[PDB]
Amino acid sequence: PIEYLLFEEPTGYAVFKVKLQQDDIGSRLKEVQEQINDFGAFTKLIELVSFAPFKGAAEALENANDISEGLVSESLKAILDLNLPKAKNITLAISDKNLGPSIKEEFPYVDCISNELAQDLIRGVRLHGEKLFKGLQSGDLERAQLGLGHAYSRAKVKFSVQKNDNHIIQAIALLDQLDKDINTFAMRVKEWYGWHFPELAKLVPDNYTFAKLVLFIKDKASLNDDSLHDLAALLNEDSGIAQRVIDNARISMGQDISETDMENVCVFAQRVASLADYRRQLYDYLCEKMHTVAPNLSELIGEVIGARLISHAGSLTNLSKQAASTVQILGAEKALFRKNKGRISRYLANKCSMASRIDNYSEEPSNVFGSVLKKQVEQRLEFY
């Protein structure tokens, strides 16, 4: 007595019309069951009659929920209204019994079915999937299922980017990478310009300064009192390097390199300057995120140190998980926490573990507890 079948897709809602009714008495016969597997037989039973794809990602989740709590969405109401005739009562087959009463309320003239016969067809519809859509645009169900999957899940758990801490792990890995590469290039700039003016590399040991100074002094021959004041403005004259570079540039040993060579020194020196500037920018980005992600842990030990501990555990969830002893050895390879000295390290390790659990497991952690815990550590520090 079934005529219409309601099915739901991640892309949208699909309605089917039952052309032929399978034998109900012999439902459990192998021969009827084999037909459900067989596409050719199944197409004789039903035919796809409607499909209305969801407008976007947001609608699918809203309907995905509304199906979950056994509710009818506006989208579902529109489709059923257009397809189901008013009619004694048209019979609709549905997977969920809970959706039954909801459908009956909105449409008094429809009778829902969720018996094994309905389940048997619903299984066949889901078995063949897009093959029954007869070329209609239903995208790819497997990916759309993936599209809705965590989307449905994270919603119930109320997952948010705020709890996300991977940004910290990426930042630390990048920051150390930047520091190594800034150093490696800056040395090459020293070698490159060292040929043209070796003494200057000795004068300004600070590599970042040296790149800036080389950018101004591209040619050591160019020496003017005004230029001396300019390079004097760079850093300070307390070291006296401003006078030394003028005197050294006058009497220095470096063989003059080509204009193309000097072009690259400043260009390469420009590259080192940008990375250090970005590294400073990323360092600040790390600093604020800890105050947002782990206000307690950062406030106890520090933003950078706390980040390194989290990276060692692999996630803030991992760090909160480990026992106090494990946390102590977690940063025992770089002396993050560092006989009386060892006692404080063990003491601090517990309070670091004390805090990590607070931050991870609080949706919006505060720093009120982090402050007092450090004050507790400070009292211990004075006592020992």
């Binding site: 397809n83 189901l84 005739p85 008013k86």
Partner: peptide, 28 residues
């Protein structure tokens, strides 16, 4: 059979249908 061309609800399902029919009763 259900047809889009003739309204099958017998009451205005969409809030638009509420607003328009109000004028039609009002107009004449």
């Amino acid at each position: 059979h259900a047809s889009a061309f003739t309204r099958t609800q017998d009451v205005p399902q969409t809030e638009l249908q509420e607003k328009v029919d109000q004028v039609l009763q009002e107009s004449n």
